[PDB]
């Protein structure tokens, strides 16, 4: 038995038996944590729009 | 030899055709 | 062979086989989802 996070694929299902999923998973985005940004130098219109 | 598949109606997977009536065998039914 | 939104179950599994789920899902939540042109008096009852 192979008990590891083995991805469910074509070939390997065609060489070994696979069970059904034990955790679902797919491609995400990762960033930088947004964090707070320096002000600018013009900042005190922001309160108002343009 | 025709093999025989089941179907349950619930849109979007299988629903009616708007002339269905008209229609025949695999061609009355579309969906995902 | 049915093709259906037919939910993966152990009780339907070990009665029936089921192939990889080609569509994944899960229990989600569904919610119901302009100032007004005098909107500067709010503040102020009239």
Same mark, same amino acid.
Not at chain 1, 3 to 31: C, H, N, Q, Y
Not at chain 2, 19 to 29: D, P, S
């Given at each position: 038995?192979?008990?590891?996070?083995?991805?469910?694929?074509? $070939?390997?299902?065609? $060489?070994?038996?696979?069970?059904?999923?034990?955790?679902?998973?797919?491609?995400?985005?990762?960033?930088?944590?947004?964090?707070?940004?320096?002000?600018? $130098?013009?900042?005190?219109?922001?309160?108002?729009?343009? | 030899?025709?093999?025989?598949?089941?179907?349950?109606?619930?849109?979007?997977?299988?629903?009616?055709?708007?002339?269905?009536?008209?229609?025949?065998?695999?061609?009355?039914?579309?969906?995902?």
């Amino acid at each position: 038995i192979a008990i590891a996070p083995l991805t469910i694929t074509l $070939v390997r299902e065609e $060489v070994i038996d696979f069970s059904k999923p034990f955790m679902s998973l797919g491609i995400s985005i990762m960033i930088k944590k947004p964090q707070k940004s320096k002000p600018g $130098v013009f900042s005190f219109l922001d309160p108002l729009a343009y | 030899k025709t093999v025989v598949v089941t179907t349950i109606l619930e849109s979007p997977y299988v629903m009616m055709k708007k002339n269905h009536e008209m229609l025949e065998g695999n061609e009355r039914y579309e969906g995902y």
